[PDB]
Amino acid sequence: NLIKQLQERGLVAQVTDEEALAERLAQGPIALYCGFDPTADSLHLGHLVPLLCLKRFQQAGHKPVAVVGGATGLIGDPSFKAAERKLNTEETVQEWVDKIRKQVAPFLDFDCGENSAIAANNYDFFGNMNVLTFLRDIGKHFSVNQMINKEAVKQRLNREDQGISFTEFSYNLLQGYGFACLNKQYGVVLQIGGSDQWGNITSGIDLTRRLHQNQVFGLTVPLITKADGTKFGKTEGGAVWLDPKKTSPYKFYQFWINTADADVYRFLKFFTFMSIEEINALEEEDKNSGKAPRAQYVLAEQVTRLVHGEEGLQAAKR
Amino acid sequence: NLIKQLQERGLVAQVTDEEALAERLAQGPIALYCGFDPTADSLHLGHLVPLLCLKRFQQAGHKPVAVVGGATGLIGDPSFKAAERKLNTEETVQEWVDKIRKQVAPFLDFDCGENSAIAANNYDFFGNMNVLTFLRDIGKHFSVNQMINKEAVKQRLNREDQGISFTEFSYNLLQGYGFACLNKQYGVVLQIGGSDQWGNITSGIDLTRRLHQNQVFGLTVPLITKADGTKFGKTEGGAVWLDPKKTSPYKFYQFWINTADADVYRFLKFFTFMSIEEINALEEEDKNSGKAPRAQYVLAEQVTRLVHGEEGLQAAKR
Ligand SMILES: N[C@@H](Cc1ccc(OS(=O)(=O)O)cc1)C(=O)O
Ligand SMILES: N[C@@H](Cc1ccc(OS(=O)(=O)O)cc1)C(=O)O
Ligand code: NA
Ligand code: NA
Ligand code: NA
Ligand code: NA
């Protein structure tokens, strides 16, 4: 039972219909997806858990689809953000799309038969779409009354000076239509993402039902939190990037070594492919050894090799 | 003084900046406009006051633009409407545009040189506009906080069974953008409409300042009411259409004959080109004649010939 195996790692925040999805996974291979927006020229550790979950699903014989947000990255996801995102130029967004497309590739298998990974660009869903087609064919299905109650944007709708553009208010419709398109064109039945994406995923489930009368599912992975409540995934006052030109393999490895004892066994479950039994045995050995814990060393080795391969790991340890 | 003379006839509900507009009108001819949506294959009495005001401005030496809503008729204006409207198909709206254009034409002079009327179709503003272009270049200028506080829609935002689609919520941006386009393409500085259009007009004034840094203006004409408080422009629970195949010249004429004494002298001011002093002298006549009022007769004769021509007036009396 794949959902139960992910639950043992703490990797399931919410599922739209856990029993129906478990029955669907049990029937054999499905196609699933996760989206990644070009907000920078690199993904960071906030993208890593869902990216590794695509690989976990592919290991269980499902077909992962990585969607790069050519269209959505021109709009900006307001979900649980206090302030409007910078509107980037088309030329800048296109350059970041290509960089992010190359970055996701190593995490998935593009050559393993029927469940080979697919990469898609949601620009394909909107590049030929007239404004009037969007507002009518998609917009008619969205209740503004329901949109203003989505937890993801509620904080933006108190004060006008802390408010939201029509631009970012529309984002929910774009990711909603993206699910309907991936279902109709690619046979995708599951979207995963961080818990912040719950409301964008359920809009897609509801819109796919409205447009196509196909039944699809949502599953969210936790936002990564530390026992001490400080922000996860910052190094010397900036993001931990997956790009070694942005965060050196050395700085990446040192980030993992510096993990708190309270966080390290959870982080092994989130960020590595070590079995639950290996992680549980490491916890016990660290508890009943008397020496300083080695969990941090293992985590730094495992994740550094995953993101930067043996070459990056030797560069970090040189 | 034009605004002053319109006020004498009861034809001015609100002006956005009366002093700055009266100054512009005194300098020389301006271009102004009023929009009509293809909600049906005909205009009705709810359209007649805005249309006659377009005519009054032209007679005063200004250049009227009659905009038919080729794009906006595909979306639907929610302003002060209790309920979401039905969508029409593109092929139907196309047909209805051509019918409304033909209905509006006779009211304006397309053959008087400088101040010749223009027929415009807002489809041209959106026909080649991609959804992402709209959301970015127009949508970034709109605060959802300000939009949900517009009087025209705020009462659709209490309960979802009385709610509003993203489609109709978007209408205000399309009309806003229409003003900006007409400003840049034709030098239009004034939009007139029914009092229901105030918020649609002010979004176009604001958007025009943001896009073009030009000051433009709005003037609303009253929604016509009966002194008895009942709905104006309904005969037998239906609309009074300007199309003689929908509302016969006879029924149209009888609608005016059956005008309340408390409405007739006010309606002579709204709907005819008689002097105030002539209408006042007619009021005097009906006051102290002993006989039946002549005013409802004069109103029926004048408005039937204005709307249906001599042929219509002859058909009304048979
Ligand atoms: N909103 C996500 C990014 C994202 C991008 C594209 C997606 O694909 S679509 O086909 O559903 O649009 C989905 C999610 C974030 O901000 O992380
Ligand atoms: N909303 C108006 C109709 C309308 C139609 C077109 C207009 O032109 S535009 O260029 O501003 O779009 C303006 C107003 C009604 O419901 O009567
Ligand atoms: Na299962
Ligand atoms: Na944005
Ligand atoms: Na509508
Ligand atoms: Na308003």
Residue numbers in the entry:
A (entry chain B), B (entry chain A): 5 to 322
Which of the paper's sentences describe this entry?
First reported in 19541, protein tyrosine O-sulfation (PTS) entails the transfer of a sulfate group from 3′-phosphoadenosine 5′-phosphosulfate (PAPS) to a protein tyrosine residue under the catalysis of membrane-bound tyrosylprotein sulfotransferases (TPSTs) in the trans-Golgi. To meet above challenges, the genetic incorporation of sTyr into proteins in response to amber nonsense codon (TAG) was reported. Here we report the synthesis of site-specifically sulfated proteins in both live yeast and mammalian cells through the genetic incorporation of sTyr using an engineered tyrosyl-tRNA synthetase derived from E. coli (EcTyrRS). In order to understand the shifted substrate specificity, we obtain a crystal structure of the evolved sTyrRS in complex with sTyr, which also shed lights on future engineering of the enzyme for substrates with similar physicochemical properties.
We obtained and refined the crystal structure of the evolved sTyrRS in complex with sTyr at 1.78 Å resolution. The protein formed a homodimer, the same as the wild-type EcTyrRS. In addition, the D182G mutation eliminates the potential repulsion between the negatively charged carboxylate group of Asp and the sulfate group of sTyr. This mutation also contributed to the lowered affinity of the evolved sTyrRS towards Tyr, due to the abolishment of a stabilizing hydrogen bond. A third mutation, W129F, contributes to the substantially lower background activity of the c2 variant towards Tyr. This is likely due to the smaller size of the Phe side chain, which further contributes to the enlarged active site. A close inspection of ligand binding revealed that the phenol ring of the sTyr tilted around 26° away from that of the Tyr. This movement enabled the formation of a hydrogen bond between the sulfate group and the hydroxyl group of Tyr37 residue. Since this Tyr is also critical for the binding of Tyr substrate in the active site of the wild-type EcTyrRS, its retention likely played a major role in the background activity of the evolved sTyrRS towards Tyr when sTyr was not available. Another key interaction that anchors the sulfate group is a hydrogen bond with the side chain of Asn126, which does not participate in substrate binding in the wild-type EcTyrRS.
